[model samples]
Target: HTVSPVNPNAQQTTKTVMNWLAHLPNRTENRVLSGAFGGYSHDTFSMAEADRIRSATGQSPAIYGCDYARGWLETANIEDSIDVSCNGDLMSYWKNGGIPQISLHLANPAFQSGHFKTPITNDQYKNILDSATAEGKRLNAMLSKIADGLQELENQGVPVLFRPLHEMNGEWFWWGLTSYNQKDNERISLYKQLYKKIYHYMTDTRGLDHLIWVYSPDANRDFKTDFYPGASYVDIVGLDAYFQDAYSINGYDQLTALNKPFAFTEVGPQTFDYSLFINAIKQKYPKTIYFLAWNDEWSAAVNKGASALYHDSWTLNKGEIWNGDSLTPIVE
Candidate 1:
């Protein structure tokens, strides 16, 4: 299959990144990749979550999820120490032939603290685009640090499913779109600008082409597309669902309308049941190509009936997607 990123001018993407994208659409009908969000170094950043699943289920997830916030965010470094790096943790997973997915729980740039939930005013939010402003300068520094990490991964021949500015439909984050259902067009437009700025800076300015961009929004609100940065800027579209099952979750049909590869970027069930979760995907949300269960109580490792989840025919675990040489669809 011949496939390429939305950005035509991107430097050559790695074979692993290209292979996953090329085959994801066809595989989504019957197969879904299993993943676990790694806890931080303080909470087993060593991928102990995936190991827990393996110990329980005798199988490992196909994707290993991590975050960049703790590594580069200012408050995180000061409070949590500067030694932990999720990018550093991802190397082993990728080398072991598992997909590496990175999320950025960015701290509010308006403040010098590592608190991502810190609130900012309209003017402070808008100042993120003006390089002359303190907010803009701090944001650029954070982006630059993330770029440096990604560039290191690129040099190591690792491709990242990079997710930034995720869950923007929710109001908890400082960069959130707006109060639920408000659909503040100006605020949404500014969000799109911020996303595009990161895209251009990372993809064009830094020339980090070994990245696959994912646009994920929280499932609570309506008009989810209000935060979308456009098809040209995102390769995959996903949703972050909590306390909502596959059938009850909003935005599936809306995201499917985008006609791009679809995934559940984050999933945490109220009453964890893997069989029900897998069946939901098999029966209802067939377009869902993969899901990364959050760490802690939401993780498959900590859930009951976890063994049966990984053993199911529809789930692809680590080492299942790639043969000895390269990534090829195990389902197809």
Candidate 2:
């Protein structure tokens, strides 16, 4: 059950990060950690969503999630400022002894992807990958801005479960493909290239090594390894399932074969049934180590399963995350 982060040359990670990662793969016996996503509109250190979970369940999630969508996009609605320090929320949660996970719904570099749904031409996509092009430069600047925020976390010794370019297989986002073609590999190639660039910029250039890279895709039939940025670039593999079953996220078996830790990066059930979800993960998707419930409608505050979710014997809350002795020695 021993495993290591895909990043071999990564800088020294924290005790919290090492302990969590070491026990992740070994906690699949009807065991899973709880997580909650805080909405993007809130301030940097807002834990309103997680607090709601605690109010309903008497336990806060082990993992706390937040988004970098607003800070990356350029729009009239408070877009004049670049607030890449969206990670501040994550750091606050980390300080509270909870794991931090981040997702990006960044703006399209080609044109107006203000809503994150605007599409760019294939040529434009390639330009964004080319460092010399204006689009590429703009993307790099955005990455740099994000790195500035992460650099602070690194300074404070906080590790993040970073999930960027998530759901690239979905058409709703600019980085995603509109349609799937098994014969055409161009889109997937661009996606992987972009992922590696982000990884390298963050780990190699920005010196942000406390990150645990996560590769996540929306649960769909075409979600194959085509979008994978290779095993070395990803520490964990996750699937985003909205109003659907997480048991068979369509790519579970394929992701399972990757031999890395697995998780539900984003889960929005049509009806929140914590007991059923937990039991199903135990029986069908036992390899799962954690699941982050999405904000808003899918959040525990609005759902009926919050009480059962945190109280469940199999679900690990913030207090229970590192309670067990290290399964594997902590990696300094």
TM-score of each: 0.90, 0.88
Query: How much is 115 displaced in model 2, in angstroms?
Result: 5.1
| Residues 31-135 of candidate 2: C-alpha lDDT, one tens digit per residue | 577888876634443688888877777889988877765645566432322354556667777666678877766767775335467767678889989989878
Q: What is the TM-score of candidate 1?
A: 0.90
Candidate 1 clash pair list: 75-114
lDDT, candidate 1, at 126: 84
lDDT of each: 0.76, 0.72
What shift in Å separates residue 243 of candidate 2 from its native position after superposition? 3.4
Model 2 residue runs over 4 Å out of place are 14-19, 25-30, 41-45, 71-73, 76-82, 112-115, 180-183, 244-248, 323-332
Query: Which 10 consecutive positions of candidate 1 have the poorest summed lDDT?
Result: 75-84
